[PDB]
Amino acid sequence: DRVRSITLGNSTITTQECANVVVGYGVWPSYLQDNEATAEDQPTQPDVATCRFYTLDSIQWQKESDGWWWKFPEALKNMGLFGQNMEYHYLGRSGYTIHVQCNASKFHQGCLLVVCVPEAEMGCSDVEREVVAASLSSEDTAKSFSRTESNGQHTVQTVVYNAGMGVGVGNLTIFPHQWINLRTNNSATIVMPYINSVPMDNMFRHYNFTLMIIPFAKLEYTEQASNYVPITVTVAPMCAEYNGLRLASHQ
Amino acid sequence: GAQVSTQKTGAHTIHYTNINYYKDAASNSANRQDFTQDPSKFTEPMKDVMIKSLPAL
Amino acid sequence: GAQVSTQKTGAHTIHYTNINYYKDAASNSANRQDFTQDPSKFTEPMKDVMIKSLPAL
Amino acid sequence: GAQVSTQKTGAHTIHYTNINYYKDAASNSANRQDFTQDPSKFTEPMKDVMIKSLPAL
Amino acid sequence: AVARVADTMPTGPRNTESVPALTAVETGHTSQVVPGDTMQTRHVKNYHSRTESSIENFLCRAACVYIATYKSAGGTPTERYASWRINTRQMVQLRRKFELFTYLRFDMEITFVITSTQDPGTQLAQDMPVLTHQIMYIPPGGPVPNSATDFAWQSSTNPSIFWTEGCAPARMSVPFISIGNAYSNFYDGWSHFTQEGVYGFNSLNNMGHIYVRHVNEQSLGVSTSTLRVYFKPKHVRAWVPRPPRLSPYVKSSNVNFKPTAVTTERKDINDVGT
Amino acid sequence: AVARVADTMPTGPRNTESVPALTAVETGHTSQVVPGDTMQTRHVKNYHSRTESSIENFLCRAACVYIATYKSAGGTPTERYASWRINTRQMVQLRRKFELFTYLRFDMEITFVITSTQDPGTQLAQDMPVLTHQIMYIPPGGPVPNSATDFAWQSSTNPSIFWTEGCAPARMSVPFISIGNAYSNFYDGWSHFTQEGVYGFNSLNNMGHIYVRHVNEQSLGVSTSTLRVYFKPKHVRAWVPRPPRLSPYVKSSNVNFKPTAVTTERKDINDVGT
Amino acid sequence: GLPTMLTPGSNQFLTSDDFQSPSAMPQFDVTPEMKIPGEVHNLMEIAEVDSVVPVNNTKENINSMEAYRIPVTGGDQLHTQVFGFQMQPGLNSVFKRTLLGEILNYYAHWSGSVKLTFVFCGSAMATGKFLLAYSPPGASPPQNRKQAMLGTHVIWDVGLQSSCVLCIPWISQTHYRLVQQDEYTSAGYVTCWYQTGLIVPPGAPPSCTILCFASACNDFSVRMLRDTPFIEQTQLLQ
Amino acid sequence: GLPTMLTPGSNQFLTSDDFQSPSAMPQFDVTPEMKIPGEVHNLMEIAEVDSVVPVNNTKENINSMEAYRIPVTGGDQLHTQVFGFQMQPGLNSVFKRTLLGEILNYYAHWSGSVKLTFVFCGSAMATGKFLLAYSPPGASPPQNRKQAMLGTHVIWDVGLQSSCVLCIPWISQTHYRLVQQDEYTSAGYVTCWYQTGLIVPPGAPPSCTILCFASACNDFSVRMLRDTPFIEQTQLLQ
Ligand SMILES: CCCCCCCCCCCCC/C=C/[C@H](O)[C@H](N)CO
Ligand SMILES: CCCCCCCCCCCCC/C=C/[C@H](O)[C@H](N)CO
């Protein structure tokens, strides 16, 4: 069916033209068991105050646009009380729910690829050098891809067909993905569990997964139609818990 | 100690013997005959089970 | 695992032992003691069974 | 002679075989799987058993 | 049997409302359409299997990971031994096979192939006994030997293997020795909590070093030797498969690249020839 | 399983008279306080073990104990063979590991690694057969060979092993051969009853000697060889653990030292940086 | 002791043997396995995933995003082909760099049936019908829709369901085909032709875009591992 | 005889194998084992023993007895720290030379929770209260008692019982930490601050001395033996 509703915390999300819900690699986000845990102290578990939908900034799908990416959970640094527990606790563990919505018309056309890339290590633009943190993820805005080659000395290689990683951009469909076809679809929701090699990790020096939105089939329309087609991203943490409470840093 | 297992032959004296000599589990031979698979996690990672003959939308 | 089979001796302690050590059927020794034969396919490839003492034509 | 013992594996065909070939006890392999301990002789070398929750003095 | 492939069940003509070919990729779903839905097929008993395509049969093949040379000369004591910070990034054929997966947990066999020669110059040997090599593994933080004939070559706790030339190659087994629960091939993050330092997997690689030397002086001439290390991962579990790499590698500590074309060119979009 | 570590049982808040943190070190007692007494913890199932930290897994690793050189020349017959009064004090890496305990009782495997070379000079060999070495153990009081090609190299009762170059290293097993009931690493006392003589463990070391030689004359040139002895103590029981040593060793028969600082310096007492 | 005899093949190093070896660090305690999601048990679970096919790889389109897109247009139509390529999933400019063809280059032999899924990424008011044909390699490649209708073909009506799976059967005389193919183990051609054509209302974009996907069925198999001819090096990477 | 085949790894000398060997002196009669008191079965029975921690190791105090003593004083107080050091039990100037840190340098990995016991060696008429804090490594080290009260802290009232065990928990994302640590496996800091301060009667010494102890809990573990970087030599000792 095409109508869904996802209620988390004090916030709901209603859609009327939905494809389905892709759920990670099969499993649902849950809490850390006693069989796998290694932190000795008691973990905190804020149910409603942390696990709720946060709406990020809006971008503009232009006719010459090529792609964007957000790195998580760094994109929700100043989003409510989820970002306040990250500063006070040394450890964190959470799953997510990534709702991406872009409605245009019956007369517009286009396509998007919404992947969630775990451990998306990204390559620099000047080889024999290294990126900096200010070039990987902005504070709330989207870092975009470039159609041509990136010339910078400390930026990500933001070419689009190599996906910023050195791999084929068509082969990104292994990861949990949907497609926003403006002919059939309106929104794309992806539920990602906690994917890491360690049971918990500090969510300041480790981007857990990267959300990429890439238009494979570009946007065209007619001059009678609208000329502003925005994309909005709404991400909710799910089953979040923390350890290691100390002073806030930073700040 | 004699773990008699079957050899590899193609479907149209097929048994072999294997002893573990050393005291560590990393010392063993390779587990070349574990042929499980579950491709539904990447092919069908959905919340609702999708039928082929029924329409998707 | 101990597949005790008979040795080769001429008709006027004749048994040997053999273990399969490796996990592949191509790793085995040769099948030197399979002595079947059927020469009727090339000697008598007829539709009707021909008797020696009865005349052919 | 076949002293079938268990290998070393981590808790989330694990047995090995060992023969003693020589006539001396010093010829054997190492006793790597004797995991006893008694730390009370150095941690609590007291005449009276001390309780944690009860005060010492 | 295990683990065979599915058979094609026989099919006749049809006129149905249940069309299986028409689907929707927008849900992020790969279709389960077998050939019996779009054409008439016959009952064949497919006896093929996927034993050669499992994870354990794909990775349990030894590959070279380093090539190290060292001398037996006098002077320049850095050339009298070789060093290796342990990586799986220096040789590309094993680096690309590992980097199809994000995480990996396995045991390993490590085979050392040492091959020597006689160095040229005056005052050659003309009668030499066999050579013997010591290949010491130093876990992270141990005493590093400054040269050959050092105190750190005693190795009362470091595992060392001694190997004379002419015999079979040296080989031992190593368990899953990581700190975490999987060898992270990719690490999207930093080393310091202030988002500064070393971006990438090079901060997670803390496995130790490998040192190899000649235990014999010789006293007449020089003989170089070439240690080649071989890695065979066994008892392999793998998680989160990645796309295979497209651009060629540049560095042994980075995923840095230069942007390459997606495929090789062809003449036309409809180029069924020739 | 064996021998795992204790789990942390879960804990809530409390307001008790039974304070477990407040204790008294004056009784000479190390406290049994687990983290559940001073903070709220959660139930984790600790699956770690202490198999790698036992006595047998700590000491059953071979370490070098001597390095001895000998010739095959003509003249100076003391260089034609090597000697060793058997010690565990000459190489430091095994000396420090033994000296964490006062007493020790074990069996042993002893591996000999012999590595030769060709000595320089005129009239070289240019065609030599393989070398063979005899490694005789003399229990205390036996006939000492004055040189190579002696009558004492018959060894009708002394255990000797003959080893050609190119094969695997020689290895045998030795029981607990002490006079007492434990190898005393430390001996606070004298040798004579009048409190005179040799103070220390050097009077208790009566284990014999080890002699190694070439059994072949050669007749053309000189080839030096280097015997390296390796000790692996197995079936180990140990008593009365000692503090590990701080100052570096000086002598092979003494605990004499020079007074060293207790640690390395740091800038301030409150030096949490950087 | 026991009298043995060393056979040929002793003291050699075969890189793909299954032998036991003494452990370097004995009685080592390994960290416990945690349930990481996404476990790969077989490499055919990766090749069974659809991935976008660069069928428009005519330079200059391989250094852009235009390699993955198929142009379709308006008037009149149907004397033109949509696309066309040989069926060679391991050795082709089209789809050897896809997810199916990357794992195929690690092997020498392949078998089974290949799926091709086609998404129509035009507007929601655009109609159309196409013919998706596959031809066995016995004869010449087709040049029009009269020669292409005789092979295995489906007809795709674009509507509320915007995808159609053309499932290429496994028709050969051998049980396996080579990955690096030749004139012997050729598989044929895959063509696409206009059935009726695009009819758009006024105010709609006249031209659209089709995307191509490729994956394996449940009877796909590979055999005879080898190294890929895809990545190279000259010296050791520092 | 029997046909064998020599695998790779033959005629090598691995220093940590478990093989049988023929005895040099056979049928040897060993002296009987007597019950010597103090048998060590495991190395963790030595690391579980408290030993005095040189936290005052600022030169010049390492060539004297003053390295083990902590100065506390009188007026007024509490804008000053008592001490402070990183949590690095294998690689630190503070407590790598203690009984816990000497056995830790024989291994590469470590895990578990560490105890710190503090004896107050002032006069029996002196009062006082202190704050013994431990901080996870996520943020900057604390500079006062307002930033140090948020971490794991206990409050120690000096009285008839003159010791308090601050038990550092095991908080990390990995099951094991390196002994030779780095920026990845850092554990944090251990600080101490005045809660109220020392109040002594007239005729009492105004300044006192705190001693620090360190040992392991019952869930401590080590792994991956290596040689210590603590002792060296150049030639053979004669
Ligand atoms: C002289 C005796 C040598 C003993 C040989 C042991 C040394 C090798 C130990 C390290 C090998 C473990 C496997 C390492 C794999 C890579 O580090 C991971 N893919 C990266 O995390
Ligand atoms: C040529 C055949 C050689 C046979 C080798 C046997 C010689 C070695 C016998 C003595 C070794 C016994 C272990 C000695 C240990 C130390 O002496 C004690 N730690 C000190 O009391």
Q: What is the DSSP string of A32-54?
A: PPTTT----BPPB--TTTTSS-E
Angstrom CA distances, H49 to A79, A220, D40, E22, G99, stand at 48, 75, 10, 72, 58
Q: Give Cβ neighbours of residue F142 (< 8 Å, ≥ 6 apart).
A: F152, F158, F208
**CA–CA gap between residue G108 and residue G90 (Å, rounded):** 9
Which residues of G are less than 8 Å from D31 in CB distance? none
Encoding tokens for residue H105? 């340098």
Using DSSP, state whether E72 is helix, strand or coil: coil
Is D54 in CB contact (< 8 Å) with chain G? no
What would the two tokens of residue E22 be?
A: 């028409």
Length of chain B: 57
3-state secondary structure of F107: strand
Pairing mode, strands E183-184 and E101-116 = antiparallel
Q: Rg (Cα) of chain F, in Å, rounded?
A: 27
d(CA F213, CA F145): 10
Measured distance CA(F205)–CA(F183) in Å, rounded: 9
- Which residues does residue H57 pair with via DSSP β-bridges, in sequence order? none
> What are the residues facing G83 on neighbouring strands?
G192
Provide the residue type at H186 as one letter.
S
Query: Residue F232 gets which letter from DSSP?
Result: E
Strands D5-6 and D15-16: antiparallel
CA distance G83 to C12: 79
Question: Which chain H residues are Cβ-neighbours of D33 within 8 angstroms?
Answer: none
The rounded distance, in Å, linking the Cα atoms of E68 and E83 is: 7
Contact E152 H178 (CB under 8 A): no
- Ligand 1 in reach of E172 Cβ (< 6 A): yes
Q: What SS3 state is found at H170?
A: coil
Q: Give the closest residue to H71 by CA, choosing from H207, H166, H206, H194.
A: H207
Method used to obtain the model:
cryo-EM
Return all residues near D18 (Cβ < 8 A) that are at least 6 apart.
D3, D5, D29
Token look-up 């050392």 returns: E112
Please give the tally of structural domains in chain H.
1
- Amino acid letter, A158: T
The token pair that represents G69 in the structure block: 């897109």
Helices first, then strands: H and E counts in chain D: 1, 2
State the Cα–Cα distance between residues F249 and D39, nearest whole angstrom: 30
| Residue ranges in chain A assigned as alpha helix (H) | 82-88
Question: Would residue F241 be called left, alpha or beta, if left means φ above 0 and alpha means ψ between -120 and 50 degrees?
Answer: beta
- Residue in C17, F172, B9, A152 with CA at minimum distance from that of residue H28: F172
Q: Is F13 exposed, middle or buried (0-12, 13-18, 19+ CB in 10 A)?
A: exposed
Residues of A in contact with F39 (CB under 8 A): 41-42
Dihedral class, residue A164 (left if φ above 0, else alpha if ψ from -120 to 50, else beta): left
Beta-bridge mates of residue E105: E237
D51 touches G at CB < 8 Å:
no
Q: Cα H101 to the chain's mean position, in Å?
A: 5
- How far is the C-alpha of G227 from the C-alpha of A48, rounded, in Å? 52
Q: Where are the alpha helices (DSSP H) in chain G?
A: 44-47, 99-104, 145-148
Question: Identity (one letter) of the amino acid at A59?
Answer: I
G27 touches chain D (CB under 8 A): yes
Distance in angstroms (rounded) separating the CA atoms of residues A85 and A76: 11
Query: Taking a C-beta distance cutoff of 8 angstroms, is the pair G212, G70 a contact?
Result: yes
- Are E195 and H176 within 8 A, CB to CB? no
Which residue bears the tokens 């196409």?
Answer: G130
Contacts of F158 (CB under 8 A, 6+ apart): F136, F137, F138, F139, F142
Domains of chain A: 4-245 (2.60.120.20)
Q: Identify the burial level of F76 via C-beta atoms within 10 angstroms of its C-beta, where 0-12 means exposed, 13-18 middle and 19 or more buried.
A: exposed
List residues bridging with H233 in a β-sheet.
Answer: none
With beta carbons less than 8 A apart as the criterion, state whether F48 and F4 touch: yes
- Round to whole Å and give the CA distance between G150 and G189: 13
**Dihedral pair phi/psi, residue H146, rounded to 5°:** -80, -30
Token pair 């049971």 in the structure block, residue: A199
Q: Which ligand is nearest to the CA of F138?
A: 2
How many CA atoms, within 13 angstroms, populate the side-chain half-sphere of residue A1? 5
| E167 contact residues in F (CB cutoff 8 A) | 168
Q: Which domain holds residue H164?
A: 1-238
C to D contact (≥3 Cβ pairs closer than 8 Å): no
The Cα of B9 is separated from the nearest Cα of chain C by a number of Å equal to 5
Q: How much distance in Å is there from the Cα of F169 to the middle of ligand 2? A: 17
CA distance H23 to chain G (A): 15
Amino acid E207 reads M
- Show the 3-state SS of chain B: CCCCEECCCCCCCCEECCCCCCCCHHHCCCCCCCCCCCCHHHHCCECCCCCCCCCCC
The residues pairing with E242 across neighbouring beta strands, listed in sequence order, are: none
Which residues in chain G are contacts of D32 at CB distance < 8 A?
A: 26-27
Q: Which residues of E touch B56 (CB under 8 A)?
A: 23-24, 27, 29
Smallest CA-to-CA distance from G129 within A141, A52, E22 is with: E22
- C-alpha F252 chain-centroid distance: 13
Physical contact, E and C (3 or more Cβ pairs within 8 A): no
Residue type, G102: E
Q: Does E110 contact ligand 1 (Cβ within 6 A)?
A: yes
- Tokens 């476990």, residue? G39
Q: How many residues does chain F have?
A: 274
- The Cα–Cα gap between H83 and H211 comes to 11
Closest Cα in chain F to A38: F44
For the sheet with H81-86, list strands across it. H81-86, H189-194, H129-135, H152-157
Give the whole-angstrom CA distance, residue A135 versus residue H49. Answer: 50
D8–G32 C-beta distance less than 8 A: no
Give the single-character DSSP code of A202: -
Angle of CA points A176, A180, A182, to nearest 5°: 170
Radius of gyration of chain C (CA): 21
With a CB cutoff of 8 Å and minimum separation 6, the contacts of H158 are: H120, H122, H126, H127, H128, H129, H130
Inter-chain CB pairs, B–C, below 8 Å: 35
G192, G84 in Cβ contact below 8 A? yes
Taking only Cα atoms into account, the Rg of chain H, rounded to an integer number of angstroms, comes to 24
What is the pairing mode between strands F225-241 and F63-70? antiparallel
CB spacing of D45 vs F28 below 8 angstroms: yes
Rounded Cα gap, residues E145 and C48, in angstroms? 89
Give the ligand with the smallest distance to the CA of G24. Answer: 1
Cβ–Cβ below 8 Å for B52 and E30: no
Q: Contact, A69 vs A155, CB < 8 A?
A: no
Q: What does the radius of gyration of chain B's CA atoms come to, in whole angstroms?
A: 21
3-state secondary structure of E109: strand
Distance from CA of B17 to the nearest CA of D (A): 12
CB atoms near residue C47 (< 10 Å): 4
Residues of chain B with a CB closer than 8 angstroms to some CB in chain C: 2, 4-5, 7-10, 13-17, 32-33
**Domain ranges for chain F:** 1-274
Task: Look at residue G23 and give its three-state secondary structure.
Answer: strand
Q: Please, which contacts does A57-60 make with residues 24 or more away whose CB atoms are closer than 8 Å?
A: A57/A140, A57/A141, A57/A142, A57/A233, A58/A230, A58/A231, A58/A232, A59/A142, A59/A230, A59/A231, A60/A228, A60/A229, A60/A230, A60/A231
Task: DSSP for F44-79, please give it.
Answer: B----B-STTBHHHHH-S-EEEEEEEE---SS-TTT
CB contact set of E155 (below 8 Å; sequence gap of 6+): E134, E136, F63, F64, F93, H15, H227
Give yes or no for A173 touching B (CB within 8 A): no
Contact call for residues G62 and E264 (beta carbons, < 8 A): yes
Query: In whole angstroms, how far apart are CA F99 and each of E154, F108, F201?
Result: 17, 17, 12
Tokens 């284990």 locate to: F207
Residue E63 beta carbon below 6 angstroms from any ligand 1 atom: no
Q: Closest to C24 (Cβ–Cβ): which among B2, B4, B8?
A: B8
Residues forming beta bridges with residue C15, ordered by sequence position: C6
Going E193 to E198 to E199 to E203, the CA torsion angle's sign is negative
Least Cα distance to G214 among G78, G81, G94 occurs for: G94
